[PDB]
Amino acid sequence: PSGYGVLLATHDDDTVDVFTSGRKMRLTCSPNIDAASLKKGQTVRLNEALTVVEAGTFEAVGEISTLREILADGHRALVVGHADEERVVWLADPLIAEDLPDDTRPRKLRPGDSLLVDTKAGYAFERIPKAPDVSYADIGGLSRQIEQIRDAVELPFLHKELYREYSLRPPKGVLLYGPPGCGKTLIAKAVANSLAKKMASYFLNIKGPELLNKFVGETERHIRLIFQRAREKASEGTPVIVFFDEMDSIFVVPQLLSEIDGVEGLENVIVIGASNREDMIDPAILRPGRLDVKIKIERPDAEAAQDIYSKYLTEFLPVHADDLAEFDGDRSACIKAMIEKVVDRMYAEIDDNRFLEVTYANGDKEVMYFKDFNSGAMIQNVVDRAKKNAIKSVLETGQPGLRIQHLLDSIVDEFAENEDLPNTTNPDDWARISGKKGERIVYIRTLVTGKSSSASRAIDT
Amino acid sequence: PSGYGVLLATHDDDTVDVFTSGRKMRLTCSPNIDAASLKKGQTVRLNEALTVVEAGTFEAVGEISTLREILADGHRALVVGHADEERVVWLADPLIAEDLPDTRPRKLRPGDSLLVDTKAGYAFERIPPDVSYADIGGLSRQIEQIRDAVELPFLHKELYREYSLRPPKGVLLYGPPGCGKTLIAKAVANSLAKKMAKSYFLNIKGPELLNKFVGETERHIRLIFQRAREKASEGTPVIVFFDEMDSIFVVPQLLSEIDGVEGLENVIVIGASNREDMIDPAILRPGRLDVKIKIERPDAEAAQDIYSKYLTEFLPVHADDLAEFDGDRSACIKAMIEKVVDRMYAEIDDNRFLEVTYANGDKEVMYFKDFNSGAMIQNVVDRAKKNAIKSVLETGQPGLRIQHLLDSIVDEFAENEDLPNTTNPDDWARISGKKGERIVYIRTLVTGKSSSASRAIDTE
C-alpha cells in the first residue's frame, strides 16, 4: 500500500520536491531510484515512509487551459482557463522537449494550443489536439482575369529581384468581386495550384459562414489561429494562400485588419478576398498594403459561355445517335455545334429571352434580356437539367443519349425558373443598370412568356 | 466496516491503482480478486487495511458532461460542462467496448451527454408519414417535379452516374399559403420510404428556433444533423424538413451543416416558404437547394382534383340529388364537384374579392378565382358538411345536397372578405408583376347582402 505524487524540482543531494495531497513537502529518495533521470511533472510514487520508490508516467487527465504564451523563464507558462482566469504553471519536460521539430504531430508549443493541467500542482503536462488539383485550364472564359491574377501573384514571386530592382512592393492581397453566381472559389484554388508548382504548395480555405458560429467561441480567439497555421509555410519558403469566401457576410470586423499587416512584412503569403457585393466591403481593408489588386469576375459574355459549356460538355457524355447522324459520326464536331447552338439561343434578343422590365425615375421603361444576366452557375444548371431530361428521355423512349432538344428545353425551363424566382440578381446589378441609364430605378418586374407555369414578380430593392 | 474506490489502472504484479478519499493510491490486492479481469472505472471496495476485497459495478450517479472529442489513442475523452470549461477524463470499460454496433448503448460520437466523475476522471454511461401522392389534389405538376429530383436519382443511381450528374441535395417548396405544402413533404418522405425490397420518416418546423425548453437553442442545429447521420451510415434515406424557413431569415450554422451532408447523398433536405422573397439566396445556390418547386394557387381543374379528395363516395349524399342521376353515386358526386367548382371560379360580381389601386391610378378587381386554396376548399367542404348535419337534425332526412355546398361557398367567401388573412405579400408580388405597376392600396369588396364589411388591407 503506497501513494503517488507529482515531481516538482530535483536537487543535488537526492532530496526531491513532490506534490501529494493538498500541500507541499520535501522527500528523500530510495537507493533504487536515480535522481538524475527523473523529469519535471513526472508522476512519482511514495511509500508509507514518504520516500520515492518509483518513477511513473505523467497525469493524463485533468483540466484544460488555452495557452497564450511561454514567459521569460521558458520553464513556465501562462495559461487561461475557460472561466477567464489566468494562471502560471510549470512546464513538464515532454512539453519543453527540444527534440520536437516544426495536424496531429509532436511539436513545440505556441499561443492557442490546449494544455492539460493540474491547477493546485501548477503543472502543464500534455497538449491536446483539436481533431487543389484544379488549374486555369478548367476555368472557362476568364482569361482576362487569370492574366491579372497571375500578374499580381505569380510574377511577384517568380521574378522577385526584378521587383526589388524597380523598388516595387509585391501586393499583399487580392480582391475577387462581381455578380453572385459568376465565378467562385474555383479561381482562388486555380491560382493557388498554378503558383504551387515552381520547383525543382499547401492550399488553405476558409469560408465566411463560420464566424458568429459557436462550437468555437464566437467572437474571440481563433482569427489569429489561422494566421498562425499559414505562418508555418510562411517562414518555410513554400507559399500559402488565405482565401476568404462570403466576405460580404462580414459587413465584428476589427481583428482582420491588424492580422493582414501582421503578415505584411512576410513576402511568402497572399490573402484573397471574394465578395458578391462590393459596395458593402469596408474600403479600409481595400486600401493599399492590405488588398491592393481588385480583379473583377464580371458576367460572361457571348463567347465565354461557349468556353464554359466546353468545360461542362465533354466527349465522355452519352450523345444521341440522331445528333451524331447529321455530323457524320464525329463526336467533337457534334458537341461543338451543340454548344454554340445553345449559347446562340441563350444570348438571343428574342421575346422569350426577356428577363426584366425596369421602370426608371423619369418614366423610361427598359427591358433586360437573360443575355446580360447569365452566369457560370446558370450554365451549369442548364447542363444538369439537360442531363436529367436525357435520363428520363432514356427511361420512356428507350434510346440513349443527350440531344440538342434537351439542351434548348433546358434553356427555356431554366429561364422560366428565374422569371418566377429572380434571386440570381442583387443590388450590384441594379447599381450597374441604373448607372448605365443615368437614372434611379423606381420599379422592377420579371417578364413571363405566358407559355409557362412561371408568373411575373415585382422585385424590391 | 469497509471503504470504496474507483480502480484506475491494472498492473502485472496484482497491485491496482485506486481513487478514494484523499491521497489516492495503488494498493496490494487480495488473492481472492484477479488483476487480469479487473476493468477501468469499475468501482471496487477495500477493507480497513487498504486491500481490495471486491470488484463491484460502475458508479451510476454524478455529474453530466457533453462530449466534445472522441480522441486518438485508446480513447480517453475531452468533455464539457455548461460552465463552459473543458475536462479530460478516462473512459470506463463499457464505453470503449468493441461489442456495440450502430435505451441501449450504440457507438458514441460528439454531442452525447456522458455521466462523469470529475475528480476520478472517469465517464461510465451515456445519457439519452402515412400520406401518399394519391391523396394530394391538384398538384400533378409539382409532385412529378419532386420525385424527378428525389426518387429518380436514388432508384437509377447508375443512370445518373453515366451522365456525370450529381443528384440534388435539397428542394425548395415555395408559394402562397393554404395548400399547406407540408403534405407534399410528407408524401415524398413516404413514397420514397418504401423502396424495399419502412425505410424512413421525420419532420421539423421552423417556428421552434428561438424556442428553448430543454437546453439552449444555439447548437440544436448540430444534434439534429447527426441524428440524420444515423441512417446515413445505414443506407436508408433521410429527409430533413424545414417548415417556415422564411422565419429564420442567426443563419450561419445551417449553411455549413448542409455542406456536411453533401458528401452523403443518402440524405435529402427539404424546406418550405410562404414568401420566397426573404430567403437568403445563399441557401438557394447550386449544391444546397437545387430544385425550386412552386406550389401555386390552384386553378379550376386543380380545384376539381382537390374537391375529389374531400368528397368520397363514402359520404352520405342526399336522395334528391342521386335521383337526378339515376341513383348513380359516383356520377352524382362528380357532377356536384364540377357544379361548385364552376360556381367558385365565376367572374360574377358576387365573387369579387379585392379592389387593388395601383400607383398609375388604375384599379383592378380580384375575383375569388385567384385566391383559392386547399384551406378554403377544405373549409367549404366542412361548412357544407355542417349544413348537412343541421339539415338532417331539423328536416330529418339524411344526405348532403348541392345547395349545402353552394351556400357554404357564398358564406366562405363572405368570411374571407371580412377577415382576409388568406392573403400574403407573395400575392401582391404577382399581381403587381402582372400589372407592371406598384400597388398603393388594397381593400376587400362585400356584396352588401352579408354581415361582413369591406376592410382595408395593408401587408408587408
Add this chain to the structure above:
Amino acid sequence: QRAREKASEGTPVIVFFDEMDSIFVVPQLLSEIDGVEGLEVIVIGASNREDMIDPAILRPGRLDVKIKIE
C-alpha cells in the same frame, strides 16, 4: 395540463385568451393546441385587432370558426 384534468372528468372548461392580438415569442402554443386535438376542451380567443394576428393560429384545425362581434 390543467384542462387535461377536466377532459376525462367530463366537465370541460375552455381556454380563453383575452387580448390575443397583443401576443403576436410564439412557437409553443401551436404545439400545445395540437396536443388537445384528439380531445373534446375548446379554445376560445378574442381580439380587438384582427390585423396583427398571425394567420398560423387561424389556419383550419387550430381556430376554425371566426366570429365577428360587430
Add this chain to the structure above:
Amino acid sequence: VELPFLHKELYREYSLRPPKGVLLYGPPGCGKTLIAKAVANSLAKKMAKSYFLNIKGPELLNKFVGETERHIRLIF
C-alpha cells in the same frame, strides 16, 4: 507642435498655452499616418530620447483583452 516646444519661453512670455491635441481631417488616401509620424520625427530631434508612438483605430472592440475601457487606461 514644434513651435510650442522649441520656444516654450517665448510662449510663456506671451501668456500662451501650448495646444494639447491636433486634429488631421479630410479625404483619403492622404497619408496622415505619415504626416503624424513626420511631425513626431521632426520634433523628435531638437538637441540642442524624445520617443515615438502610434495606435490605430482598428483595435477597439476586438478583444484579446475584454472590454476596451481597460486599455485606454494603460496606454496613457
